[PDB]
Amino acid sequence: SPGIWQLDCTHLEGKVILVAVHVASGYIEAEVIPAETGQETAYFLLKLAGRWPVKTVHTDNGSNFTSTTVKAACWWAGIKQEDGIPYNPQSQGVIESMNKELKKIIGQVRDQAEHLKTAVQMAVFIHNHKRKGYSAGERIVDIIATDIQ
Amino acid sequence: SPGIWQLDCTHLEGKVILVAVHVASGYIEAEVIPAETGQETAYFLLKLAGRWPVKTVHTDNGSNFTSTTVKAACWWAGIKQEDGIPYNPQSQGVIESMNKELKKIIGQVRDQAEHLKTAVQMAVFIHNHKRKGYSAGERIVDIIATDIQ
Numbered sequence: 318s319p320g321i322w323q324l325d326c327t328h329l330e331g332k333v334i335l336v337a338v339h340v341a342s343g344y345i346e347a348e349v350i351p352a353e354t355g356q357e358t359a360y361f362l363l364k365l366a367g368r369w370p371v372k373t374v375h376t377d378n379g380s381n382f383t384s385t386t387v388k389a390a391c392w393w394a395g396i397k398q399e400d401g402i403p404y405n406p407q408s409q410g411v412i413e414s415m416n417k418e419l420k421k422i423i424g425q426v427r428d429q430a431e432h433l434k435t436a437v438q439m440a441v442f443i444h445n446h447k448r449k450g451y452s453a454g455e456r457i458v459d460i461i462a463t464d465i466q
Numbered sequence: 467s468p469g470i471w472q473l474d475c476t477h478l479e480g481k482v483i484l485v486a487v488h489v490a491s492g493y494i495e496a497e498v499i500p501a502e503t504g505q506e507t508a509y510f511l512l513k514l515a516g517r518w519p520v521k522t523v524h525t526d527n528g529s530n531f532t533s534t535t536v537k538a539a540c541w542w543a544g545i546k547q548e549d550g551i552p553y554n555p556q557s558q559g560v561i562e563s564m565n566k567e568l569k570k571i572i573g574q575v576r577d578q579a580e581h582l583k584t585a586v587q588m589a590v591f592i593h594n595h596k597r598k599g600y601s602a603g604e605r606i607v608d609i610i611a612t613d614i615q
């Protein structure tokens with residue numbers, strides 16, 4: 318499970334926040350996009366897979382699962398695309414909670430950032446650095462290091 | 467050592483490619499921007515520091531070193547800004563060589579990507595995954611994991 322990620326799309330200020338969560342650690346990367354198109358999702362996954370060893374992605378919905386451009390990016394990057402259907406129901410609630418938590422952080426920084434995209438990146442930072450005692454950033458690095466060795 | 471990054475700005479197709487290199491591993495993150503401004507650099511560093519434990523950045527030039535927006539991002543993210551002056555002179559040539567490498571990769575994929583930004587992300591992927599026998603992606607995870615424990 319060191320290579321497993323989940324896509325998550327949430328909305329705020331009439332914009333779309335696209336999130337990738339590393340399932341085993343809770344570590345995230347996120348971007349603001351105008352709308353959640355196959356093309357945007359494909360580009361986001363290319364960026365993600367160049368940065369971390371992404372083996373499997375649970376896509377966030379059937380449109381992206383279907384998307385020719387998403388399928389092309391996954392092929393290019395060596396990613397196995399899977400559905401993101403919560404056969405374990407506690408999955409959906411974990412996501413919902415993260416979306417709520419991310420929006421909360423965004424609200425707390427919203428003041429220090431002129432643009433939504435800045436506040437989202439501040440939120441990524443705070444989320445990944447939060448000690449819970451290791452942080453998500455520490456967990457993902459330990460998980461993947463153990464996997465290499 | 468595990469926390470040290472160098473900024474590097476290179477040009478192609480009339481656009482700017484902004485690179486951050488993890489000095490100890492050769493691992494990189496990169497983006498295409500229309501122009502290298504303080505605001506763009508500041509945003510790039512915010513994103514980088516939310517994703518990896520960035521302690522020190524050797525900035526690529528004195529305009530970004532001076533930039534009040536870059537200084538504000540570095541303050542926000544807990545980054546020590548340093549100059550990028552190569553007291554070790556083999557530094558310039560290492561950068562120069564990576565820029566040449568990156569541009570070569572971009573040329574090799576240039577055909578598979580409509581947009582420069584896609585080709586740059588493909589080049590980041592190929593760079594970070596190349597076995598050298600570990601890859602840069604493997605090196606950065608082991609360096610930082612060793613540092614955590």
Ligand SMILES: CCCCNC(=O)[C@@H](NC(=O)N(C)Cc1ccc2c(c1C(=O)O)OCO2)c1ccccc1
Binds near residue numbers: 506
């Ligand atoms: C309403 C509160 C406004 C107080 N903050 C500021 O005046 C400046 N913000 C910063 O110094 N930083 C660290 C954040 C930041 C960094 C880079 C960027 C940004 C932002 C951003 O704020 O969204 O936008 C695009 O490139 C600022 C800088 C540039 C443009 C606008 C604002």
Ligand SMILES: CCCCNC(=O)[C@@H](NC(=O)N(C)Cc1ccc2c(c1C(=O)O)OCO2)c1ccccc1
Binds near residue numbers: 357393577582
């Ligand atoms: C010159 C030969 C072009 C052959 N490739 C294609 O037709 C498509 N490319 C892909 O399937 N992928 C994986 C790459 C990609 C992914 C996502 C994106 C992209 C690109 C990109 O190509 O730049 O642009 C922004 O969002 C394509 C898709 C959408 C727009 C344009 C092209």
Ligand SMILES: [Cl-]
Binds near residue numbers: 594603
């Ligand atoms: Cl990788």
Ligand SMILES: [Cl-]
Binds near residue numbers: 446516517518
């Ligand atoms: Cl981190």
